[PDB]
Design a protein around this ligand. Sequence first.
Ligand SMILES: Nc1ncnc2c1ncn2[C@@H]1O[C@H](COP(=O)(O)O)[C@@H](O)[C@H]1O
Ligand SMILES: O=P(O)(O)OC[C@H]1O[C@@H](O)[C@H](O)[C@@H]1O
Ligand SMILES: [Mg+2]
Ligand SMILES: [Mg+2]
Lengths: 432, 48, 311, 22, 48
Amino acid sequence: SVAAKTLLIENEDGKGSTRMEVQDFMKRFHMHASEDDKTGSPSTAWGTLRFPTKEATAPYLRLSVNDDPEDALLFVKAMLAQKYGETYDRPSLILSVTGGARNFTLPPRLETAIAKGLRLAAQRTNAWVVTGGTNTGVMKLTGQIMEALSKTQSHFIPPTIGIATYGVIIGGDDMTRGEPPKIGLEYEMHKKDPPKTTPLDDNHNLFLLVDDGSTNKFGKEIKFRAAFENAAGQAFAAPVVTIVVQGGPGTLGTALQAVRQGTPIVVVDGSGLAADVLAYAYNFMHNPLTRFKSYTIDDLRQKVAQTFNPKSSQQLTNLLDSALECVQDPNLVVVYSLQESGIDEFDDCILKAIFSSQGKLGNKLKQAMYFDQLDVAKRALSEASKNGQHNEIAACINDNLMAAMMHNKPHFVELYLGFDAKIYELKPSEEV
Amino acid sequence: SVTGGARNFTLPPRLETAIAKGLRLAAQRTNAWVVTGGTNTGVMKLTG
Amino acid sequence: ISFRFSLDQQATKINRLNSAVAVHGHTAEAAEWYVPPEEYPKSGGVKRYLIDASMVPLSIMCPSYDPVEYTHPSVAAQPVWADPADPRKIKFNVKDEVNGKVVDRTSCHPSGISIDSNTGRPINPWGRTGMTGRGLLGKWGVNQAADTVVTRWKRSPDGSILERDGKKVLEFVAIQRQDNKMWAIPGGFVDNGEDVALTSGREFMEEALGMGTSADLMSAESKDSLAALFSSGTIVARIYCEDPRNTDNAWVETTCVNFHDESGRHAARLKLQGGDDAEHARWMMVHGGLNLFASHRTLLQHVTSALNAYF
Amino acid sequence: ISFRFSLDQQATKINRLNSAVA
Amino acid sequence: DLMSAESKDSLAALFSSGTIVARIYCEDPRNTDNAWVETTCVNFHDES
Ligand SMILES: Nc1ncnc2c1ncn2[C@@H]1O[C@H](COP(=O)(O)O)[C@@H](O)[C@H]1O
Ligand SMILES: O=P(O)(O)OC[C@H]1O[C@@H](O)[C@H](O)[C@@H]1O
Ligand SMILES: [Mg+2]
Ligand SMILES: [Mg+2]
């Protein structure tokens, strides 16, 4: 339709948005014409892509490796602010989906459980889902899960942000050429692009194409993706939860990076490969059940050797050492398994990962309210009460009661009112 | 005879409900004389 | 089922032949012998004289042996814990008094320490390292180190001890070293005029607990709990250390002291916080695939051998 | 559980150093 | 066919702990008065 000329970019104070011209704001993103180039030129590749059989268009931004992730975060906030107004539903959860690049088939019960839990978590927390954005494997699977969410729900649809390396994407030249922005640009996934062979997933709602001037090289967007998730987590005061489904050797290093920075991970057991390796390793080191007493480092080494097939013994030793290093802290890894947890317990695993993360008690009570787990909130309040954190309970009880009233949770309203919270002492969030 | 803390204290709601229900049932069934300290703080105020 | 397994493992718990030569062929790996890395730590790129692992022992001749003599500037500046530069007045293999303070100077090697006639420097009985001089080590000959392995059984919330391979699983306090960022057992060199008893406890409070200059003062009951924990220790091993700072004239030998908490009450009261020459400290699971600094895996093997734990 | 505890305590039931002076 | 590099290590681990249980005369039908078979028995037990 009519191309946008002005955008509401949020101020650094976090209290207001200023209206400014689109060409003025978008100048800060750079692109590289070739690998040799370092400084670059301003990006002419941004706009919206129209995918066949999809009603809505997805914004795309091609940005350099040296660009600030806060600027990209401002761009995503500006798109959401433009489409849904200034008072759009802020995310209380960032869901990072990592795993296998190549295509894989999962069992129907397991797929149904992952799909149901991810949809419930995304619709209850208005979560930002960050994946790789290509039309293969876990990214395509996550897109398929969120496709039903975009159909069954009206007004706000939780974003499926795809952060991909620009050098492998089919149709990059078509996206680059022209005068920006490109309103409703047709994306031809079946068009024969000669050097590149990886297309974008049509179910992702927003695209960040990270460019370094290289062609047909993967893994260039990992650091920016991690930085963007951390930046989003600091900005919205929301936990970042990584989800690991299948995965190769680099997924192990990605999970290792996630657990070293304090970010919790949810490992899907039974999906095969690196997820099975991570799940075995945790179960070997931490799980007290009987069927995990026969687990050994030798059988784990055999499992790593049969799945990842290393060339050398030293490579196998390093992979085994890294896998054991990821599950050192039992709080930061949550393993979801069908034969132990249950079909309708994946969202509970996501909530346990949220509670195991670093955050304030009031925010954790709000997350427990969103998932409708009254027992978890009762246990958290009792544990906080026993450990001498009564001051934080009294400090957050008013805001928790307010949040419980807004999100239609009457049992939580009764629970918060029972712990000496006066009804006539409520306070508004903003200042009149 | 109700004895305990002189200073004010907050109990969990389930525990408070259980103590209140049991003490009321015992007092109404036996026509019991409840002897406390009589001041408006703590366990005496709670018994009141 | 847990009890069915437990009862099953409760009953299974000159005439020795090794037939592995039939599968592989001719064997002779000789991987037991320790060879330190080429670049000396914290020396600014100073490199040793390389030696294959089949040339390390002193019984073998090796005529092409030309080690490099290097001493660190910190050791050469002469602090209180550093021996004098001329070792001719130092008496080895007996307890020697320097400035009225007792130093051990006895090695756990059965042959003993042999003294070179030309320079008076001691010769390492555990093999060649391709390097003479003291390096980063302050004392000629045996640098006595004490390591503190504070252990507890790895337990789940319900209170049951975790069991792997039919044996109970241990858990030890591990520190991340400041110099090389590898996890290790807390411990340090034995100071002049003091014994292993004071040294083991003092280094564990300074490094694992941060009780030197990096933490608040403990309560009167926590000190009694820590004293109760520290009153029952067993010396499990006294071995040579595969430490990369070792040279031909100065080598580290360790005495390992294990403080085991059977009930787990005293171990649970410890507030782990890295101090001194340690960045982070944590309760870590003991197993055979651990990648730790120097020969601490051998020390953990000795602890699990003594306690009949999983390794 | 009583038996789980009982079986757990049924398996735990010159080289001596006193480091309480530190 | 040739075994994998980890199966050979597993078989070597199995074969590294053997106990000679008996060294006896063999009731072999090919035995004669001037040539008889005597056996050494090696047991490789897999506890796990
Ligand atoms: N014989 C010794 N050799 C080396 N360092 C020693 C010795 N006795 C005490 N020390 C001290 O112990 C500290 C621990 O070593 P480091 O981990 O390198 O800091 C050294 O920095 C020295 O200050
Ligand atoms: O004195 P620092 O460097 O702190 O530690 C000495 C270590 O050097 C190793 O051989 C010993 O096991 C001992 O733990
Ligand atoms: Mg030291
Ligand atoms: Mg130390």
